[PDB]
């Protein structure tokens, strides 16, 4: 009520979208609010790629507050690549606006089949300045530097399909969203919202592991070796050459992920990382986990984690707040 609140909706009960506009005239767009990137892009009227056929497009000519740039840009993600150029206009998030530098995408061929298979228009990064391309100060930071918000921090309360809507709260924390106390973990770097925690699954542990809280990732990312040791005696079936892991949803051997610090302990049991795949077979589930190796052993805590845990992203205090999310609002 006192801070900016953007309503969130789930997408195929895994990911979630939020809306925001560009230009002095509204011009709405559906975004993937990605704490794992630091750039903002939107499909341009100038787009020529097939993937833009179903999307809302941005038209600078119809915006008085438009400021041209033109410097070609290539935004790279783990899942794909999108091309275009830089531009600047009024970005309206929730109910606050600000002149912001963003990317006008015109080529989305490197982001298929994801882009055409999804209903979002663009991506709105919520990471750190250094993660951006073209030295762009985060939206929440800029907003704070302009006395538009009390604190430079945003909150995420993911939505549950047929249960409740979600919220991206900017500026302040609201107890309506979480239960119990909040616990903060300091960032180990000002790039992604990356913190350090011990990763313990079974008798397998990886201490001082790099954990990235990323709303832009649909799954739980685990280092390859860690995953393999993890699925050893379990009764999971990895379809040959595919990151497709199937099990009986009631499989009594399924472990609980346990991330710890001297401040708190965060767990993620089966019900949070399993996806029903009943259409495939009765009583069947898939792990929604992915083996992914980075320079430094990293765990990506995506939507599955954020779905169980209300999260606070503090730019001013360079830390992440974690608390148990409310079952219902």
């Amino acid at each position: 009520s006192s801070n900016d609140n953007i309503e969130l909706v789930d997408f195929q009960n895994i990911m979630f979208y939020g809306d925001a506009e560009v230009g002095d005239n509204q011009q709405p767009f559906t975004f993937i609010l990605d704490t794992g990137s630091a750039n903002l892009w939107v499909p341009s009227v100038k787009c020529t790629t097939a993937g833009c056929l179903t999307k809302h497009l941005y038209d600078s000519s119809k915006s008085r507050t438009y400021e041209k740039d033109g410097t070609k840009v290539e935004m790279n993600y783990v899942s794909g690549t999108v091309s275009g150029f830089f531009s600047k206009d009024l970005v309206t998030v929730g109910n606050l606006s600000l002149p912001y530098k963003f990317i006008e995408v015109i080529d989305t061929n490197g982001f298929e089949p994801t882009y055409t298979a999804s209903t979002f228009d663009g991506i709105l990064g919520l990471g750190w300045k250094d993660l951006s391309i073209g030295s762009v100060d985060p939206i929440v930071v800029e907003l704070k530097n302009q006395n538009k918000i009390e604190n430079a921090l945003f909150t995420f309360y993911l939505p549950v399909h047929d249960k409740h809507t979600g919220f991206l709260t900017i500026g302040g924390i609201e107890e309506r969203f979480y239960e119990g106390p909040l616990t903060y973990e300091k960032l180990n770097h000002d790039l992604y919202w990356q913190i350090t925690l011990d990763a313990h699954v079974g008798n397998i542990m990886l201490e001082k592991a790099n954990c990235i809280v990323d709303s832009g990732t649909s799954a739980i990312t685990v280092p390859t070796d860690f995953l393999n040791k993890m699925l050893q005696n379990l009764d999971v079936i990895k379809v040959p050459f595919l990151p497709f892991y199937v099990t009986l949803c009631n499989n009594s051997k399924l472990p609980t992920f346990e991330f710890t610090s001297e401040n708190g302990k965060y767990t993620l049991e089966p019900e949070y990382y399993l996806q029903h795949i009943e259409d495939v077979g009765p009583g069947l589930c898939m792990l929604n986990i992915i083996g992914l190796d980075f320079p430094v052993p990293t765990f990506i805590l995506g939507d599955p984690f954020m779905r169980k845990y209300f999260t606070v992203f503090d730019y001013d205090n360079h830390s992440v707040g974690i608390a148990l999310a409310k079952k219902n609002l």
């Binding site: 993937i32 990137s37 750039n39 783990v78 690549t81 990064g125 832009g216 990506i300």
Partner: peptide, 6 residues
């Protein structure tokens, strides 16, 4: 799946 920057 989707894994969001380089």
């Amino acid at each position: 799946x989707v894994v969001x920057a380089x």
